[PDB]
Amino acid sequence: GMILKRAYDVTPQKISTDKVRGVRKRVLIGLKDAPNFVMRLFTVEPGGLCDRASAPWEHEIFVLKGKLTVLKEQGEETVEEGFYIFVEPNEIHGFRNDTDSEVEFLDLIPKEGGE
Amino acid sequence: GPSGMILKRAYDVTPQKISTDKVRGVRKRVLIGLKDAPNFVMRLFTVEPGGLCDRASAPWEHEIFVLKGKLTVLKEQGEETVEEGFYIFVEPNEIHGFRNDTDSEVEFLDLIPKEGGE
Ligand SMILES: [Cu+2]
Ligand SMILES: [Cu+2]
Ligand SMILES: [Cu+2]
């Protein structure tokens, strides 16, 4: 009834789509197990990009490592470890890493959006 | 529903003292609370040295990510240690609690469905 695990030990999946390059995803608590919402951990490589998109669901994010550039419907904002991010449903968002070291963030969404 | 995005340093949120029949030595920051959340809430808990959230269970799940320190997890039967970089999934109704057996603060994110409050 309880899972306790090192996130690093969860296998990181390379993500590659027309909008996503240089990103890896770990599914910590996935759709199958989740009553309501899922927990993922993203790694963005230097120069990596999750380009602007809208989703039907909100995001709740916590920046774990590095300087995360957040793309908005207009412009961008770079934040760092210790910031949280709440993206309303339907809002344009994306992410980039302009730095020379990997950026990591925790990302939770309602399970309707889980892989 | 609203549009937009909130980007905020977690430590800018006021750390509220939690004092109940089961909890001492704990502060909570509500990061994404009921005022905002479509479905689930995000809190950041700080457990001071010797702090305790005694065993309990709840009718909803917890999804936890340990940000800092070494946290003792209280289970139905026994205890287990985790540290920074561990995650915890607590099924609904499973007994769980926490204790800080170290001399430094432990911090963890704790997310619950919004039906459970903030
Ligand atoms: Cu159990
Ligand atoms: Cu998204
Ligand atoms: Cu609980």
PDB file of C-alpha atoms and ligand atoms in Angstrom:
ATOM      1  CA  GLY A   1       0.000   0.000   0.000  1.00  0.00           C
ATOM      2  CA  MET A   2       3.050   2.243  -0.079  1.00  0.00           C
ATOM      3  CA  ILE A   3       5.828   2.624  -2.660  1.00  0.00           C
ATOM      4  CA  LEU A   4       9.129   4.205  -1.595  1.00  0.00           C
ATOM      5  CA  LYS A   5      11.674   4.512  -4.415  1.00  0.00           C
ATOM      6  CA  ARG A   6      14.637   6.593  -5.569  1.00  0.00           C
ATOM      7  CA  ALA A   7      13.426   8.599  -8.556  1.00  0.00           C
ATOM      8  CA  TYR A   8      16.785   8.233 -10.327  1.00  0.00           C
ATOM      9  CA  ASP A   9      16.257   4.482 -10.397  1.00  0.00           C
ATOM     10  CA  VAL A  10      13.141   4.872 -12.547  1.00  0.00           C
ATOM     11  CA  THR A  11      14.124   4.482 -16.154  1.00  0.00           C
ATOM     12  CA  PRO A  12      14.405   7.736 -18.140  1.00  0.00           C
ATOM     13  CA  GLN A  13      12.640   7.578 -21.503  1.00  0.00           C
ATOM     14  CA  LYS A  14      13.929   9.713 -24.363  1.00  0.00           C
ATOM     15  CA  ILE A  15      11.147  11.852 -25.831  1.00  0.00           C
ATOM     16  CA  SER A  16      11.297  12.866 -29.495  1.00  0.00           C
ATOM     17  CA  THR A  17       8.370  14.477 -31.360  1.00  0.00           C
ATOM     18  CA  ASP A  18       8.006  17.445 -33.743  1.00  0.00           C
ATOM     19  CA  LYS A  19       7.906  19.663 -30.648  1.00  0.00           C
ATOM     20  CA  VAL A  20      10.208  17.830 -28.237  1.00  0.00           C
ATOM     21  CA  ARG A  21      13.945  17.259 -28.495  1.00  0.00           C
ATOM     22  CA  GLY A  22      16.630  16.675 -25.871  1.00  0.00           C
ATOM     23  CA  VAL A  23      14.179  15.652 -23.132  1.00  0.00           C
ATOM     24  CA  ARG A  24      13.902  12.528 -20.993  1.00  0.00           C
ATOM     25  CA  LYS A  25      10.927  11.512 -18.882  1.00  0.00           C
ATOM     26  CA  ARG A  26      10.628   9.272 -15.843  1.00  0.00           C
ATOM     27  CA  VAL A  27       7.147   8.114 -14.868  1.00  0.00           C
ATOM     28  CA  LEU A  28       7.297   7.902 -11.081  1.00  0.00           C
ATOM     29  CA  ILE A  29       3.592   7.299 -10.384  1.00  0.00           C
ATOM     30  CA  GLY A  30       1.806   6.329 -13.570  1.00  0.00           C
ATOM     31  CA  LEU A  31      -1.698   6.184 -14.910  1.00  0.00           C
ATOM     32  CA  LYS A  32      -2.227   2.522 -14.006  1.00  0.00           C
ATOM     33  CA  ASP A  33      -1.505   3.093 -10.301  1.00  0.00           C
ATOM     34  CA  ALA A  34      -2.857   6.648  -9.821  1.00  0.00           C
ATOM     35  CA  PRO A  35      -6.362   7.266  -8.475  1.00  0.00           C
ATOM     36  CA  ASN A  36      -6.360  10.867  -9.735  1.00  0.00           C
ATOM     37  CA  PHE A  37      -3.049  12.328 -10.957  1.00  0.00           C
ATOM     38  CA  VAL A  38       0.365  11.182 -12.148  1.00  0.00           C
ATOM     39  CA  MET A  39       3.901  12.139 -11.166  1.00  0.00           C
ATOM     40  CA  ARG A  40       6.721  12.496 -13.708  1.00  0.00           C
ATOM     41  CA  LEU A  41      10.292  13.815 -13.584  1.00  0.00           C
ATOM     42  CA  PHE A  42      11.636  15.491 -16.714  1.00  0.00           C
ATOM     43  CA  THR A  43      15.273  16.065 -17.618  1.00  0.00           C
ATOM     44  CA  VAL A  44      16.024  18.676 -20.252  1.00  0.00           C
ATOM     45  CA  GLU A  45      19.464  18.413 -21.852  1.00  0.00           C
ATOM     46  CA  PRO A  46      21.479  21.492 -22.818  1.00  0.00           C
ATOM     47  CA  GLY A  47      19.764  23.007 -25.806  1.00  0.00           C
ATOM     48  CA  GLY A  48      16.704  20.792 -25.291  1.00  0.00           C
ATOM     49  CA  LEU A  49      13.216  22.047 -26.050  1.00  0.00           C
ATOM     50  CA  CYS A  50       9.584  21.161 -25.368  1.00  0.00           C
ATOM     51  CA  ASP A  51       8.046  23.630 -27.756  1.00  0.00           C
ATOM     52  CA  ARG A  52       4.937  25.686 -27.089  1.00  0.00           C
ATOM     53  CA  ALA A  53       1.727  23.699 -26.851  1.00  0.00           C
ATOM     54  CA  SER A  54      -1.604  23.691 -25.019  1.00  0.00           C
ATOM     55  CA  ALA A  55      -2.974  20.740 -23.085  1.00  0.00           C
ATOM     56  CA  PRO A  56      -6.482  20.004 -21.843  1.00  0.00           C
ATOM     57  CA  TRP A  57      -5.104  19.669 -18.303  1.00  0.00           C
ATOM     58  CA  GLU A  58      -3.143  21.775 -15.830  1.00  0.00           C
ATOM     59  CA  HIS A  59       0.464  21.216 -14.843  1.00  0.00           C
ATOM     60  CA  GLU A  60       1.898  21.394 -11.325  1.00  0.00           C
ATOM     61  CA  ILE A  61       5.682  21.591 -11.532  1.00  0.00           C
ATOM     62  CA  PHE A  62       8.576  21.928  -9.132  1.00  0.00           C
ATOM     63  CA  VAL A  63      12.046  22.801 -10.434  1.00  0.00           C
ATOM     64  CA  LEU A  64      14.590  20.397  -8.946  1.00  0.00           C
ATOM     65  CA  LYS A  65      17.866  21.306 -10.680  1.00  0.00           C
ATOM     66  CA  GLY A  66      19.140  24.126 -12.880  1.00  0.00           C
ATOM     67  CA  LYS A  67      17.711  27.093 -14.740  1.00  0.00           C
ATOM     68  CA  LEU A  68      14.494  26.225 -16.554  1.00  0.00           C
ATOM     69  CA  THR A  69      13.314  28.572 -19.291  1.00  0.00           C
ATOM     70  CA  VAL A  70       9.530  28.592 -19.373  1.00  0.00           C
ATOM     71  CA  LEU A  71       7.881  29.496 -22.669  1.00  0.00           C
ATOM     72  CA  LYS A  72       4.586  31.388 -22.418  1.00  0.00           C
ATOM     73  CA  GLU A  73       1.927  32.428 -24.930  1.00  0.00           C
ATOM     74  CA  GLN A  74       3.909  35.654 -25.091  1.00  0.00           C
ATOM     75  CA  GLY A  75       7.569  35.650 -24.132  1.00  0.00           C
ATOM     76  CA  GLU A  76       9.430  33.503 -21.643  1.00  0.00           C
ATOM     77  CA  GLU A  77      10.662  33.498 -18.068  1.00  0.00           C
ATOM     78  CA  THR A  78      13.709  31.652 -16.724  1.00  0.00           C
ATOM     79  CA  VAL A  79      13.397  30.307 -13.190  1.00  0.00           C
ATOM     80  CA  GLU A  80      15.575  28.026 -11.102  1.00  0.00           C
ATOM     81  CA  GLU A  81      15.625  25.225  -8.582  1.00  0.00           C
ATOM     82  CA  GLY A  82      13.138  25.869  -5.807  1.00  0.00           C
ATOM     83  CA  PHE A  83      10.479  27.498  -7.999  1.00  0.00           C
ATOM     84  CA  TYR A  84       7.089  25.938  -8.467  1.00  0.00           C
ATOM     85  CA  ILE A  85       5.020  26.434 -11.594  1.00  0.00           C
ATOM     86  CA  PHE A  86       1.282  26.155 -12.007  1.00  0.00           C
ATOM     87  CA  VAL A  87       0.092  26.116 -15.623  1.00  0.00           C
ATOM     88  CA  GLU A  88      -3.677  26.541 -16.021  1.00  0.00           C
ATOM     89  CA  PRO A  89      -5.474  24.077 -18.277  1.00  0.00           C
ATOM     90  CA  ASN A  90      -5.341  25.098 -21.937  1.00  0.00           C
ATOM     91  CA  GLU A  91      -2.575  27.687 -21.485  1.00  0.00           C
ATOM     92  CA  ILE A  92       0.318  27.734 -23.944  1.00  0.00           C
ATOM     93  CA  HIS A  93       3.492  26.489 -22.302  1.00  0.00           C
ATOM     94  CA  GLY A  94       6.813  24.966 -23.150  1.00  0.00           C
ATOM     95  CA  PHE A  95      10.325  24.628 -21.773  1.00  0.00           C
ATOM     96  CA  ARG A  96      13.915  25.096 -22.868  1.00  0.00           C
ATOM     97  CA  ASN A  97      17.359  24.660 -21.346  1.00  0.00           C
ATOM     98  CA  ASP A  98      19.828  27.348 -22.418  1.00  0.00           C
ATOM     99  CA  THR A  99      22.474  26.271 -19.899  1.00  0.00           C
ATOM    100  CA  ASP A 100      25.360  23.810 -20.222  1.00  0.00           C
ATOM    101  CA  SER A 101      24.082  21.345 -17.623  1.00  0.00           C
ATOM    102  CA  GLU A 102      20.944  19.232 -17.309  1.00  0.00           C
ATOM    103  CA  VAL A 103      17.773  20.758 -15.896  1.00  0.00           C
ATOM    104  CA  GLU A 104      15.298  18.630 -13.937  1.00  0.00           C
ATOM    105  CA  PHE A 105      11.715  19.278 -12.882  1.00  0.00           C
ATOM    106  CA  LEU A 106       8.914  17.334 -11.253  1.00  0.00           C
ATOM    107  CA  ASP A 107       5.662  17.478 -13.203  1.00  0.00           C
ATOM    108  CA  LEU A 108       2.210  16.317 -12.122  1.00  0.00           C
ATOM    109  CA  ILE A 109      -0.922  16.278 -14.250  1.00  0.00           C
ATOM    110  CA  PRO A 110      -4.390  14.781 -13.859  1.00  0.00           C
ATOM    111  CA  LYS A 111      -4.408  11.192 -14.971  1.00  0.00           C
ATOM    112  CA  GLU A 112      -6.455  11.942 -18.113  1.00  0.00           C
ATOM    113  CA  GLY A 113      -3.164  13.142 -19.560  1.00  0.00           C
ATOM    114  CA  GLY A 114      -0.974  10.257 -18.450  1.00  0.00           C
ATOM    115  CA  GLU A 115       0.920   8.108 -20.958  1.00  0.00           C
TER     116      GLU A 115
ATOM    117  CA  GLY B   1     -11.704  28.707 -15.985  1.00  0.00           C
ATOM    118  CA  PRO B   2      -8.729  30.999 -15.516  1.00  0.00           C
ATOM    119  CA  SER B   3      -5.798  31.304 -17.875  1.00  0.00           C
ATOM    120  CA  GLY B   4      -2.168  32.024 -17.219  1.00  0.00           C
ATOM    121  CA  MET B   5       0.611  30.475 -15.220  1.00  0.00           C
ATOM    122  CA  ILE B   6       2.062  31.090 -11.742  1.00  0.00           C
ATOM    123  CA  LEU B   7       5.852  30.933 -11.359  1.00  0.00           C
ATOM    124  CA  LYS B   8       7.004  31.444  -7.771  1.00  0.00           C
ATOM    125  CA  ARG B   9       9.874  30.653  -5.413  1.00  0.00           C
ATOM    126  CA  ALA B  10       8.436  28.138  -2.928  1.00  0.00           C
ATOM    127  CA  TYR B  11      10.189  29.751   0.011  1.00  0.00           C
ATOM    128  CA  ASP B  12       8.307  32.985  -0.683  1.00  0.00           C
ATOM    129  CA  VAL B  13       5.152  31.223   0.602  1.00  0.00           C
ATOM    130  CA  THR B  14       4.475  31.585   4.334  1.00  0.00           C
ATOM    131  CA  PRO B  15       5.400  28.489   6.342  1.00  0.00           C
ATOM    132  CA  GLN B  16       2.422  27.774   8.582  1.00  0.00           C
ATOM    133  CA  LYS B  17       2.954  25.902  11.857  1.00  0.00           C
ATOM    134  CA  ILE B  18       1.081  22.604  12.031  1.00  0.00           C
ATOM    135  CA  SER B  19       0.120  21.575  15.539  1.00  0.00           C
ATOM    136  CA  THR B  20      -2.456  18.811  16.025  1.00  0.00           C
ATOM    137  CA  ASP B  21      -2.891  15.693  18.150  1.00  0.00           C
ATOM    138  CA  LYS B  22      -0.526  13.879  15.767  1.00  0.00           C
ATOM    139  CA  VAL B  23       1.838  16.583  14.489  1.00  0.00           C
ATOM    140  CA  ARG B  24       4.614  18.671  16.063  1.00  0.00           C
ATOM    141  CA  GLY B  25       7.700  20.353  14.640  1.00  0.00           C
ATOM    142  CA  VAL B  26       6.244  20.764  11.163  1.00  0.00           C
ATOM    143  CA  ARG B  27       5.528  23.728   8.915  1.00  0.00           C
ATOM    144  CA  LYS B  28       3.531  23.721   5.720  1.00  0.00           C
ATOM    145  CA  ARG B  29       3.653  25.975   2.663  1.00  0.00           C
ATOM    146  CA  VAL B  30       0.601  25.711   0.427  1.00  0.00           C
ATOM    147  CA  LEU B  31       2.115  26.191  -3.045  1.00  0.00           C
ATOM    148  CA  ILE B  32      -0.858  25.314  -5.251  1.00  0.00           C
ATOM    149  CA  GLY B  33      -3.896  25.416  -3.026  1.00  0.00           C
ATOM    150  CA  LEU B  34      -7.649  25.309  -3.228  1.00  0.00           C
ATOM    151  CA  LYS B  35      -7.825  28.880  -4.548  1.00  0.00           C
ATOM    152  CA  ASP B  36      -6.093  27.679  -7.733  1.00  0.00           C
ATOM    153  CA  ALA B  37      -6.222  23.902  -8.075  1.00  0.00           C
ATOM    154  CA  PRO B  38      -8.458  22.265 -10.680  1.00  0.00           C
ATOM    155  CA  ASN B  39      -7.889  18.770  -9.277  1.00  0.00           C
ATOM    156  CA  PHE B  40      -5.055  18.370  -6.763  1.00  0.00           C
ATOM    157  CA  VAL B  41      -2.981  20.517  -4.416  1.00  0.00           C
ATOM    158  CA  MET B  42       0.756  20.935  -3.869  1.00  0.00           C
ATOM    159  CA  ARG B  43       2.215  21.532  -0.400  1.00  0.00           C
ATOM    160  CA  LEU B  44       5.791  21.769   0.807  1.00  0.00           C
ATOM    161  CA  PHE B  45       6.304  20.357   4.295  1.00  0.00           C
ATOM    162  CA  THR B  46       9.278  21.148   6.502  1.00  0.00           C
ATOM    163  CA  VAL B  47       9.959  18.740   9.351  1.00  0.00           C
ATOM    164  CA  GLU B  48      12.311  20.216  11.931  1.00  0.00           C
ATOM    165  CA  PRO B  49      14.755  18.011  13.833  1.00  0.00           C
ATOM    166  CA  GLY B  50      12.755  15.659  16.037  1.00  0.00           C
ATOM    167  CA  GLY B  51       9.519  16.625  14.295  1.00  0.00           C
ATOM    168  CA  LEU B  52       6.733  14.103  13.955  1.00  0.00           C
ATOM    169  CA  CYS B  53       3.598  13.422  11.924  1.00  0.00           C
ATOM    170  CA  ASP B  54       2.315  10.400  13.765  1.00  0.00           C
ATOM    171  CA  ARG B  55       0.745   7.435  12.033  1.00  0.00           C
ATOM    172  CA  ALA B  56      -2.586   8.074  10.390  1.00  0.00           C
ATOM    173  CA  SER B  57      -4.552   7.088   7.359  1.00  0.00           C
ATOM    174  CA  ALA B  58      -6.755   9.115   5.052  1.00  0.00           C
ATOM    175  CA  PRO B  59      -9.424   8.376   2.430  1.00  0.00           C
ATOM    176  CA  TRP B  60      -7.214   9.759  -0.345  1.00  0.00           C
ATOM    177  CA  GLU B  61      -3.773   9.026  -1.716  1.00  0.00           C
ATOM    178  CA  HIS B  62      -0.568  10.961  -1.184  1.00  0.00           C
ATOM    179  CA  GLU B  63       2.106  11.575  -3.809  1.00  0.00           C
ATOM    180  CA  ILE B  64       5.330  12.757  -2.149  1.00  0.00           C
ATOM    181  CA  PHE B  65       8.746  13.833  -3.362  1.00  0.00           C
ATOM    182  CA  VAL B  66      11.590  14.350  -0.884  1.00  0.00           C
ATOM    183  CA  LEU B  67      13.502  17.553  -1.600  1.00  0.00           C
ATOM    184  CA  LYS B  68      16.014  17.718   1.256  1.00  0.00           C
ATOM    185  CA  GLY B  69      17.244  15.558   4.098  1.00  0.00           C
ATOM    186  CA  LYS B  70      16.707  12.072   5.443  1.00  0.00           C
ATOM    187  CA  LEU B  71      13.131  11.242   6.397  1.00  0.00           C
ATOM    188  CA  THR B  72      11.910   8.361   8.516  1.00  0.00           C
ATOM    189  CA  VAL B  73       8.659   6.954   7.143  1.00  0.00           C
ATOM    190  CA  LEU B  74       6.308   5.337   9.613  1.00  0.00           C
ATOM    191  CA  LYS B  75       4.454   2.377   8.135  1.00  0.00           C
ATOM    192  CA  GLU B  76       1.705   0.102   9.417  1.00  0.00           C
ATOM    193  CA  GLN B  77       4.441  -2.294  10.405  1.00  0.00           C
ATOM    194  CA  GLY B  78       7.782  -0.647  11.073  1.00  0.00           C
ATOM    195  CA  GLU B  79       9.780   2.206   9.650  1.00  0.00           C
ATOM    196  CA  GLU B  80      11.809   2.895   6.535  1.00  0.00           C
ATOM    197  CA  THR B  81      14.252   5.669   5.680  1.00  0.00           C
ATOM    198  CA  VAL B  82      14.223   7.708   2.548  1.00  0.00           C
ATOM    199  CA  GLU B  83      16.169  10.783   1.494  1.00  0.00           C
ATOM    200  CA  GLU B  84      16.340  13.622  -1.023  1.00  0.00           C
ATOM    201  CA  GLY B  85      15.398  12.301  -4.459  1.00  0.00           C
ATOM    202  CA  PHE B  86      12.993   9.592  -3.245  1.00  0.00           C
ATOM    203  CA  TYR B  87       9.321   9.607  -4.061  1.00  0.00           C
ATOM    204  CA  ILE B  88       6.546   8.010  -2.071  1.00  0.00           C
ATOM    205  CA  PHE B  89       3.130   6.841  -3.178  1.00  0.00           C
ATOM    206  CA  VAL B  90       0.675   6.228  -0.335  1.00  0.00           C
ATOM    207  CA  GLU B  91      -2.494   4.413  -1.398  1.00  0.00           C
ATOM    208  CA  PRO B  92      -5.799   5.591   0.099  1.00  0.00           C
ATOM    209  CA  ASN B  93      -6.306   4.227   3.606  1.00  0.00           C
ATOM    210  CA  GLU B  94      -2.699   3.054   4.059  1.00  0.00           C
ATOM    211  CA  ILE B  95      -1.140   3.942   7.417  1.00  0.00           C
ATOM    212  CA  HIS B  96       1.656   6.480   7.057  1.00  0.00           C
ATOM    213  CA  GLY B  97       3.578   8.998   9.156  1.00  0.00           C
ATOM    214  CA  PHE B  98       6.922  10.735   9.229  1.00  0.00           C
ATOM    215  CA  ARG B  99       9.652  11.580  11.695  1.00  0.00           C
ATOM    216  CA  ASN B 100      12.898  13.540  11.402  1.00  0.00           C
ATOM    217  CA  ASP B 101      15.594  11.609  13.273  1.00  0.00           C
ATOM    218  CA  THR B 102      18.376  13.915  12.066  1.00  0.00           C
ATOM    219  CA  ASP B 103      19.715  17.275  13.177  1.00  0.00           C
ATOM    220  CA  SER B 104      18.789  19.071   9.945  1.00  0.00           C
ATOM    221  CA  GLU B 105      15.507  20.053   8.353  1.00  0.00           C
ATOM    222  CA  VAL B 106      13.734  17.710   6.013  1.00  0.00           C
ATOM    223  CA  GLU B 107      11.582  19.064   3.212  1.00  0.00           C
ATOM    224  CA  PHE B 108       9.155  17.230   0.975  1.00  0.00           C
ATOM    225  CA  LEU B 109       6.430  17.975  -1.509  1.00  0.00           C
ATOM    226  CA  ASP B 110       3.094  16.367  -0.731  1.00  0.00           C
ATOM    227  CA  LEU B 111       0.234  16.318  -3.234  1.00  0.00           C
ATOM    228  CA  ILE B 112      -3.298  15.129  -2.534  1.00  0.00           C
ATOM    229  CA  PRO B 113      -6.561  15.312  -4.493  1.00  0.00           C
ATOM    230  CA  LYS B 114      -8.284  18.590  -3.700  1.00  0.00           C
ATOM    231  CA  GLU B 115     -11.228  16.769  -2.077  1.00  0.00           C
ATOM    232  CA  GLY B 116      -8.829  16.339   0.869  1.00  0.00           C
ATOM    233  CA  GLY B 117      -8.317  20.059   1.300  1.00  0.00           C
ATOM    234  CA  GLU B 118      -4.969  21.785   1.374  1.00  0.00           C
TER     235      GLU B 118
HETATM  236 CU    CU C   1      -1.573  -1.672   3.005  1.00  0.00          CU
HETATM  237 CU    CU C   2       1.981  20.242 -21.038  1.00  0.00          CU
HETATM  238 CU    CU C   3      -1.959  11.686   5.102  1.00  0.00          CU
END
